[PDB]
Design a protein around this ligand. Structure first.
Ligand SMILES: NC(=O)C1=CN([C@@H]2O[C@H](COP(=O)(O)OP(=O)(O)OC[C@H]3O[C@@H](n4cnc5c(N)ncnc54)[C@H](O)[C@@H]3O)[C@@H](O)[C@H]2O)C=CC1
Ligand SMILES: NC(=O)C1=CN([C@@H]2O[C@H](COP(=O)(O)OP(=O)(O)OC[C@H]3O[C@@H](n4cnc5c(N)ncnc54)[C@H](O)[C@@H]3O)[C@@H](O)[C@H]2O)C=CC1
Ligand SMILES: NC(=O)C1=CN([C@@H]2O[C@H](COP(=O)(O)OP(=O)(O)OC[C@H]3O[C@@H](n4cnc5c(N)ncnc54)[C@H](O)[C@@H]3O)[C@@H](O)[C@H]2O)C=CC1
Ligand SMILES: NC(=O)C1=CN([C@@H]2O[C@H](COP(=O)(O)OP(=O)(O)OC[C@H]3O[C@@H](n4cnc5c(N)ncnc54)[C@H](O)[C@@H]3O)[C@@H](O)[C@H]2O)C=CC1
Lengths: 268, 268, 268, 268
């Protein structure tokens, strides 16, 4: 019962319970949504994490680079939600960039093969997912992906920033396609969230200066966010995704909502 | 009962029942909000329009250019909502630009006195209102103003576009001040809505070519909006304002939400 | 002889020899331009400063708030450059915001009268100047104003940022008018330059925290500028204005060139 | 002799004499630059076209997807310009997107392999080129790539728009690397230019509706460009690239210059 009551919503992107997609799933369920989850490699792992969601959700394997996964995905989803039932909501919370595309590995040293894979998973998959899923979405539906504002360059994020810029562009095109279905497509630009991966990088897994830069990045974010930014709390982000999954932003599409504390609106 | 349940919200900007602020008020009430309304010149008129709101709301006179109105405004509001009661929400839906700052009057011919008055009412008043009202707002509160995307120049809107650019800038500063109160400040960038004024301009009240350009503007908007744009329906806008007035965009401030059909994300 | 050879160019905005407009004038003359200068209040003062320009330039009084100054300005300019001679170039380097609109004076405490005056001089005057001068500009001509990127809020700059946002908007409209003359209109967004006024603010003239914030602002600018930023050197800015005054950016109008070290393209 | 006098400048991207890079090369030579050209597949063809350049230029093979081409590229260039001679300028004018990523082929139907190749050539190659060439560039140097404003989605350009968004992002990162060399990196966002490829698409080579949309795109561009836009003339673009290759935009990097008639600053 609540914001998303009665809505059926596929949430990709759970890998640990500190995944942003975990909290989107959690908040969505608290808000009445019925979910279908997708999970990339470690399905036993993800099933076990998602057990802690306030409700059961069928989990489906989706490797966004796997053409057959995508080819089969809408059938598997209507299996999970039942025939004559369509999705109202799709959450893309998938992202990856090989280590060479990030951190201390010099920007120019990331091999295109690595960059392409990251763009595949992080950008192009937003379109793949919309292609697989728009056929099984209701008018009034809503696709949401997870963005990290790439409008300016920053240390360490390197090719993942480039991947996010591609994503923003994809999302504008997905909006165009989604529009034919009465469906909105939008990104949520989140502030830095202390995801397991993020904590690794902060603690030096991608090099000390990268880890140092990201820590400075985090602190500056909260400093300039007029409402502050708490990187340890994904809930404001999860709620924002739910905001877009709902009927309360019905004239917004091709767009980016900044759940970033307002940090992007402030220079210092 | 609903999105705004229990929230106390001042809504400025009702002048006719096709005022965008009428529908924000309507939707807000449908959603559980308790309102205080403010009304500019024709208070008998506005009282009579707002009678059609699904609930009663105290109406208070506010001329945003009247220092005493603003000086007295928070007292009058706690009178209306009761002592020890604070606002959760503030809607700025005020805008005006003298005729010389718009339409067929050449851009260079608008006298500064006229432009200044328009900027006063349309931009600076967003700050005035936040100054008067932040003292009587709860943490978690939300100020919302009404924007018309001025990031590119357009025919006929002339100095009102300039006034909107000023407003976007003001809002970023208001966010900074509002943040000290745990309060968000944001604009909703709406698509063209057929307000009484808009219909006048379309029908030539500001000159035929202006009226012609705005009609083209309207049609192009709906053409490029991937979800379409219905200028006769302010509801998607009103809902978007409610989205921001709620707890569902809690990490967004200093910001602009585009309730414009997605038209701004598309070139053609 | 050089970039601006043969071009006749009005340069407003000289008040001291550390005025950005001093260096634009200097570089423009080094580059072959013939100048007409305008000067606001202290004409004896400005004449004496401009004596150090590599060439003579007629100086003309222009108070951008003085309707008669503007009304008479094009006659005075053709007097200065000779009948049947038209301007190729116009440099708006004028800006002012009362102290209440800046620094430590709380944002909400700037009286509209003060803000309006600042917007008058800093934003609306860009249009006034184009109105006075477009009648006496050649096809292929170029108007340039001085911008400080107001796309995000910052400490201390307060209402001057708002004034800059208005200016960016004005410039897009001026481009539209200027286009009818074969004339481009553009802003140069400069990095912080240690102008006499700036040095005052840094040293606390507008309050210690403002002065502190602006110093941090300056340092962060140079830190994130991939090519660095030297606030003590206005030459890169002056050259950029000359770039726009020339024939080398002939397809650019309504636009903003960032002579800011690239600082705006970088987050950290 | 002129703007680029004495500058040594590698210009990629000539394939026909209506290549934008042909005209950049032409204008650069008219302006005193000494060039080294690179050419992708049809080297006999390109040699024969470039014979019409006002001066000789060594032509070097560069397939931007060929790691060995890039690995060897700086040696070949110092061979061509002579030992102890460094580049002042680099022009990236390379772009390609497989047909499936464009026009009438539905956006969702472009296979990632196709999109990746386009992003490789159109975006990632900007970084490859800067990596190969920054070692042989002088302080004060300038890399320039060719952009088509992808900030909003448009018909037919599909994945090439996405590729341009990636490019804008790459360029911000290249600026960071280039900065260590005293080198600027910037894009020129050009208006639609009637290149041979463009004419094909207009005449239906990628589908009739795509061809129709691009024609509408072209016409709207010139309509909203306050100075007009002539798609048949690449010279304003070529001059703009030269503007960036010169010393006249010395404080600009990570940036985008819009040689688009001012069309992007205008809504209608
Ligand atoms: N952590 C942060 O500070 C921010 C993250 N984001 C975005 O949020 C989204 C979710 O990531 P986080 O929660 O941070 O990280 P996470 O590591 O918890 O989730 C990333 C997800 O991507 C999935 N994934 C990777 N490759 C996949 C593939 N081949 N097919 C299907 N799924 C695949 C992983 O299984 C994982 O669940 C990502 O798009 C990320 O870029 C946006 C802003 C900030
Ligand atoms: N109509 C449209 O297409 C769009 C309008 N907007 C904005 O929506 C807001 C509301 O306007 P609309 O509903 O369109 O028009 P409206 O005419 O219905 O409302 C404008 C309101 O401004 C109030 N106002 C004018 N001067 C005032 C003053 N001195 N003090 C206090 N209030 C004053 C009027 O009383 C009126 O209620 C305005 O900010 C407008 O610029 C934004 C996007 C599009
Ligand atoms: N100093 C900086 O860090 C930056 C300054 N700018 C802009 O550069 C432009 C020139 O200012 P600066 O060289 O910094 O300061 P400045 O103090 O040297 O020049 C400002 C000029 O405005 C003129 N002015 C003020 N009121 C006027 C009026 N009523 N009529 C005619 N002229 C009037 C003054 O006489 C003065 O010459 C201004 O637009 C400023 O906002 C832009 C970016 C950065
Ligand atoms: N034609 C237009 O309306 C606009 C084009 N641009 C950009 O201008 C740049 C130059 O293209 P145009 O002159 O229009 O087209 P063009 O077809 O004349 O030049 C494109 C160049 O890319 C080169 N290229 C393709 N694959 C390559 C590879 N593997 N390695 C090395 N070079 C390769 C081709 O040989 C060709 O010279 C491109 O980046 C394009 O996207 C930007 C805005 C508008």
């Amino acid at each position: 019962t609540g914001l998303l009551d009665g809505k059926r919503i596929l949430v990709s992107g759970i890998i640990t319970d500190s995944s942003i997609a975990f909290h989107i799933a959690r908040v969505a369920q608290e808000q009445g949504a019925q979910l279908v989850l997708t999970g990339f490699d470690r399905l036993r792992l993800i099933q076990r994490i998602t057990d802690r969601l306030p409700a059961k959700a069928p989990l489906l394997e989706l490797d966004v680079q796997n053409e057959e996964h995508l080819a089969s995905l809408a059938g598997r989803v209507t299996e999970a939600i039942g025939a004559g039932n369509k999705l109202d909501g799709v959450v893309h919370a998938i992202g990856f960039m090989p280590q060479t595309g990030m951190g201390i590995n010099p920007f120019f040293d990331a091999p295109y093969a690595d960059v392409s894979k990251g763009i595949h998973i992080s950008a192009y998959s937003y379109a793949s997912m919309a292609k697989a899923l728009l056929p099984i979405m209701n008018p009034g539906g809503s696709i949401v992906g997870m963005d990290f504002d790439p409008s300016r360059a920053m240390p360490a994020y390197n090719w993942m920033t480039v991947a996010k810029s591609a994503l923003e562009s994809v999302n504008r095109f997905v909006a165009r396609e989604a529009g034919k279905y009465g469906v909105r497509s939008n990104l949520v630009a989140a502030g830095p969230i202390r995801t397991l991966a993020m904590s690794a990088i902060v603690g030096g897994a991608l090099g000390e200066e990268a880890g140092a830069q990201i820590q400075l990045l985090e602190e500056g974010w909260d400093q300039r966010a007029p409402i502050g930014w708490n990187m340890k709390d994904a809930t404001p982000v999860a709620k924002t995704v739910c905001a877009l999954l709902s009927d309360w932003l019905p004239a917004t599409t091709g767009d980016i909502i900044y759940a970033d504390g307002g940090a992007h609106t402030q220079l210092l």
